[PDB]
Amino acid sequence: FEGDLKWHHHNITYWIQNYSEDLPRAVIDDAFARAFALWSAVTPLTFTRVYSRDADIVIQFGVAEHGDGYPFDGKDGLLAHAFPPGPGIQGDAHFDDDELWSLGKGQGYSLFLVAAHQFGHALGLDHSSVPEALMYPMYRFTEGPPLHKDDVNGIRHLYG
Amino acid sequence: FEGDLKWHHHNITYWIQNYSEDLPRAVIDDAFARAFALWSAVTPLTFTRVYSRDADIVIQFGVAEHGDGYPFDGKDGLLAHAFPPGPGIQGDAHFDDDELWSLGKGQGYSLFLVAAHQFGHALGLDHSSVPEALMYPMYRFTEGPPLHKDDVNGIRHLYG
Ligand SMILES: CC(C)[C@H](C(=O)NO)N(CCNC(=O)c1cccc(C(=O)NCCN([C@@H](C(=O)NO)C(C)C)S(=O)(=O)c2ccc(-c3ccccc3)cc2)c1)S(=O)(=O)c1ccc(-c2ccccc2)cc1
Ligand SMILES: [Ca+2]
Ligand SMILES: [Ca+2]
Ligand SMILES: [Ca+2]
Ligand SMILES: [Ca+2]
Ligand SMILES: [Ca+2]
Ligand SMILES: [Ca+2]
Ligand SMILES: [Zn+2]
Ligand SMILES: [Zn+2]
Ligand SMILES: [Zn+2]
Ligand SMILES: [Zn+2]
């Protein structure tokens, strides 16, 4: 991000404001957990689920206009969007409830794969030129380990 | 791009190498000239159709691996791509023909809107951060004028 936005503490907490009705509540729970663990492993940061709106990364599902004045757009297209590291809406991540959300092998979009990407933005990662990476802004389904040299080099540029 | 690549001659030529069967050849050429007519007005450049490989911007359709080593991906995902001005393959614009090319409201990706974006890339524009611009790297069908200030600030920066 412009001016290299990054967290200035290591215990990044997340709150899930709501759940989509495509998956069971707890599948989605795990789906997010694993997405953080993708980043906890390569960062000096740790990720703590909490139940409090003072959480760093607040997470929600939502259709069209949903608060930030950055409305979604129906089926397909915008999958989800995440804001840089900072106070308030910064850090958050929303998922277009008009997209069918599921886990890999499902017809719909991988909530884990899309959550993986969103959380990288929340950590200060923008998009990557490398078409094979996670922060590459084109969702291709993958059963292989979603991180790649470029996602990790980015995140090490930020938090060491 | 990082070096701000541009043309170094004002009278650009173009060759429509091969055709999709999605449209008429006569509509495709016209679609094509109508996208050069977005960039001809706002620049010192003219855009002359030739019938030669020695053309500056060579337009070809292709599936998967197709000569440039930047393969496509079946229907959806990639629509097309172009390379900043320069010799040979630079300036060229390639259309994934695993996409139903069309015009207007309905099925298909408008070859005209798609080409306009493509042809601004071949003059050396990158993508635009402004979600309503032609050079926004996301396709939304509009029946309105595809050129916005940001796009015109773009090529003015290169040539104007
Ligand atoms: C908040 C937004 C911005 C959001 C997102 O990022 N959230 O984090 N969207 C993504 C929208 N795209 C971008 O943000 C972006 C930023 C910088 C560069 C690019 C870009 O290069 N996109 C690819 C465009 N293609 C070509 C191109 O543009 N040639 O000119 C490239 C490959 C050369 S394309 O062939 O698909 C193409 C796209 C649009 C046009 C076009 C546009 C306007 C008019 C006419 C045509 C033409 C070609 C895209 S998003 O759709 O919600 C999204 C997308 C992917 C993922 C993800 C990625 C990896 C793994 C799992 C999931 C998550 C979300
Ligand atoms: Ca959407
Ligand atoms: Ca937040
Ligand atoms: Ca949904
Ligand atoms: Ca060329
Ligand atoms: Ca395609
Ligand atoms: Ca076709
Ligand atoms: Zn939002
Ligand atoms: Zn993204
Ligand atoms: Zn190509
Ligand atoms: Zn583009």
Identify which ligand lies nearest to the alpha carbon of B62: 10
The 8-class DSSP code of residue A153 comes to H
Integer Cα distance of A152 and A90 in angstroms:
22
Report residue A102 CA to chain centroid gap: 15
CB pairs under 8 A between A and B: 8
For residue B83, the CA-to-ligand 10 centroid distance in Å is 9
Mind spelling out the 3-state secondary structure of A34-56? HHHHHHHCCCCCEEEECCCCCCC
**Superfamily the domain A1-160 falls into:** Collagenase (Catalytic Domain) (3.40.390.10)
Report residue B118 CA to chain centroid gap: 2
Identify which ligand lies nearest to the alpha carbon of A58: 3
For residue A37, the CA-to-ligand 11 centroid distance in Å is 33
Integer Cα distance of B92 and B107 in angstroms:
26
Of A73, A77, A138, the CB nearest to B77: A138
Length of chain B, in residues: 160
Integer Cα distance of A128 and A149 in angstroms:
11
Cβ–Cβ of A140/B73 closer than 8 Å? yes
Integer Cα distance of A102 and A80 in angstroms:
14
From chain A, the residues in CB contact with B77 under 8 A are 138, 140
* Minimum-distance ligand 1 atom for the alpha carbon of B113: 45
For residue A117, the CA-to-ligand 9 centroid distance in Å is 6
- Which residue in chain A has the smallest CA separation from B74? A140
Beta bridge partners of A13: A48
The 8-class DSSP code of residue B1 comes to -
The resolution, in Å, is: 1.9
B→A contacts (Cβ < 8 Å), by residue, are 73, 77-78, 137-138, 140
Integer Cα distance of A117 and A52 in angstroms:
23
Which CA distances in Å does A56 have to A49, A108, A154, A156?
10, 28, 21, 20
Nearest CA, atom 4, ligand 1: A81
Instruction: Tell the residue number behind the tokens 């010192």, with chain if given.
Output: B44
Q: Look up residue A86 and give its two tokens.
A: 């900072």
The structural domains of chain A, with segments of one domain joined by +, span: 1-160
Integer Cα distance of B41 and B45 in angstroms:
8
- DSSP SS3 for A139: coil
Integer Cα distance of B86 and B63 in angstroms:
24
